[PDB]
DNA sequence: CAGTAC
DNA sequence: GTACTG
């Protein structure tokens, strides 16, 4: 087939971008079968190709709830005080979700620890998590999992699921980042940059020092932000509910 | 770098 | 913009 469509075909593989798609085209690959049989694949790339059709589908919002609930009960078995809030497209109220991002924390700020591994293991035993892509357990106090899940029963597709465990100290900035949207987050951190601050999935800092070129040369001091709206306030912004946030 | 998360 | 692993 023509160049542009084939590049698009390859790019829709998880773990494959515009550079990988271009390289594969030079090798002479045109179809997904060519990639599956001849191309050197990353473990992640192998999974994305395996679930190519299912990953292209957006899911009904109801299914996202059904997934968030599946994770929630698995975690709450270990600790019933645990919080489980689905973010991303879901929290912003979209009728469809391309994936599910479940955020987890605990009010005491202690018992959230030691859940991440046990939770994933519990979900693997349940048959819920089917494949794993990336696991980053050295996010400072946060841990993030990138994997694939599938609800039980006939006629179920594989969905992409993100699970994140944060301390209650960072709960505000954690879901502020994960509900998005991406170009909402982009402009809040850009805004803080102007106000001499920095925003992140961990904290909103003030007093951040930047050089003449604006490169950050000193971190600021972390401002305690219990809720989302505390963050909105310190940035001199009118608050936006998540639905307002999609953009 | 490349791809990814929002 | 901020920031993680492949």
Swiss-Prot record:
It is found in: Nucleus; Chromosome. Changing residue 178 to G/R: Strongly reduces polymerase and terminal transferase activities. Residues 92-101 are annotated as: Involved in primer binding. Residues 17-20, 138-177 are annotated as: DNA-binding. Expressed in a number of tissues. Abundant in testis. It comes from the Eukaryota. DCTP binds at residues 58, 89-92, 98-101, 185. Mn(2+) binds at residues 99, 101, 162. Interacts with PCNA. Interacts with PAXX; promoting POLL recruitment to double-strand breaks (DSBs) and stimulation of the end-filling activity of POLL. Interacts with XRCC4; promoting POLL recruitment to double-strand breaks (DSBs) and stimulation of the end-filling activity of POLL. Interacts with NHEJ1/XLF; promoting POLL recruitment to double-strand breaks (DSBs) and stimulation of the end-filling activity of POLL. Belongs to the DNA polymerase type-X family. DNA polymerase that functions in several pathways of DNA repair. Involved in base excision repair (BER) responsible for repair of lesions that give rise to abasic (AP) sites in DNA. Also contributes to DNA double-strand break repair by non-homologous end joining and homologous recombination. Has both template-dependent and template-independent (terminal transferase) DNA polymerase activities. Also has a 5'-deoxyribose-5-phosphate lyase (dRP lyase) activity. This is DNA polymerase lambda. It comes from Homo sapiens (Human).
